[PDB]
Amino acid sequence: CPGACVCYNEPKVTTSCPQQGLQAVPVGIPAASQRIFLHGNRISHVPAASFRACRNLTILWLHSNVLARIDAAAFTGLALLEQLDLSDNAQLRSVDPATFHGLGRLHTLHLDRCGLQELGPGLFRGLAALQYLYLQDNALQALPDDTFRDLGNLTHLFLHGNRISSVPERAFRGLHSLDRLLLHQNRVAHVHPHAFRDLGRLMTLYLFANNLSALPTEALAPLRALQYLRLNDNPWVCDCRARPLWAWLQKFRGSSSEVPCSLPQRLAGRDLKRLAANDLQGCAV
Ligand SMILES: CC(=O)N[C@@H]1[C@@H](O)[C@H](O)[C@@H](CO)O[C@@H]1O
Ligand SMILES: CC(=O)N[C@@H]1[C@@H](O)[C@H](O)[C@@H](CO)O[C@H]1O
């Protein structure tokens, strides 16, 4: 086994060379390795077919490594790959759309704390098996249509800490079985109704800290079975336009947060969840 690593077959075959100051992926990683650990090094690249001979690789960790570019090939024969953590590489900024193409059995994929500015075309094409998909704290500006379409088992989608400015119909389409997506700490101005139009089964949604003035009507409608909704820290305007949300909150059985009206004044500071129906004026004008 390569130096600066410990190798064992014990539970599953591991290579493990974490925090060993490695500058690049060592050449001698034994092929019949099941799980490989390379986080905490200084590996700045994942060149084409870096783990090819490891046909039985289940777990692979490269997080916290000053990654800069990950060859479109990279994970090529890692068909049995389950977890692939590339988190904490604020210098990556991007992943060639065809990168994860194979990765069928992929269960969990971490791409958080990465300079990801955009989510390319088929970045997540047919990742079917995927359930956990971490994408918090990147530079993502928008969620383009059908971006998570093929992700049918996805039950955990984290997108907070980005720069998403709005949620269009397209995004979150095939996301059936999605149990909880967080969108907090984003710049969400508008949430197109129907945007959650098959986002049922969803257990918990987060939209706090987001620059939302008021939510459309049919917006929270599909969220039958929702149990946790966090809407604090938003410029909630409270005029007749808030009725739909006001209403949706009253009939809500689950657990909500505080929806602080931050406008108009005179009502400013009060929480929409406790305003009486006729507190919302300034109608059709
Ligand atoms: C809860 C559910 O729908 N189970 C299926 C599972 O049978 C299948 O193996 C997987 C694909 O890897 O998709 C879904 O997770
Ligand atoms: C545990 C098991 O199924 N055995 C195979 C083994 O025959 C093969 O040599 C190896 C490739 O390195 O992949 C393993 O999965």
From Swiss-Prot:
- Membrane-topology annotation of the record: Lipid-anchor; GPI-anchor
Source organism of the structure: Homo sapiens
Q: Which disease is it linked to?
A: Schizophrenia: A complex, multifactorial psychotic disorder or group of disorders characterized by disturbances in the form and content of thought (e.g. delusions, hallucinations), in mood (e.g. inappropriate affect), in sense of self and relationship to the external world (e.g. loss of ego boundaries, withdrawal), and in behavior (e.g bizarre or apparently purposeless behavior). Although it affects emotions, it is distinguished from mood disorders in which such disturbances are primary.
The entry's protein name is Reticulon-4 receptor
Tissue specificity annotation: Widespread in the brain but highest levels in the gray matter. Low levels in heart and kidney; not expressed in oligodendrocytes (white matter).
What phylogenetic lineage does the species belong to? Eukaryota, Metazoa, Chordata, Craniata, Vertebrata
- Keyword Acetylation among record annotations: no
Known outcome of mutating residue 201 to C: In SCZD; uncertain significance
GO BP terms in the entry: axonogenesis; cell surface receptor signaling pathway; corpus callosum development; negative regulation of axon extension; negative regulation of axon regeneration; negative regulation of neuron projection development; neuronal signal transduction; positive regulation of GTPase activity
Query: Which residue numbers delimit the LRRNT domain?
Result: 1-28
What does the PTM comment state? Answer: N-glycosylated. O-glycosylated. Contains terminal sialic acid groups on its glycan chains.
Q: Name one GO molecular function term.
A: signaling receptor activity
Taxonomically, which superkingdom?
Eukaryota
Q: List the disulfide bonds.
A: 1-7, 5-17, 238-261
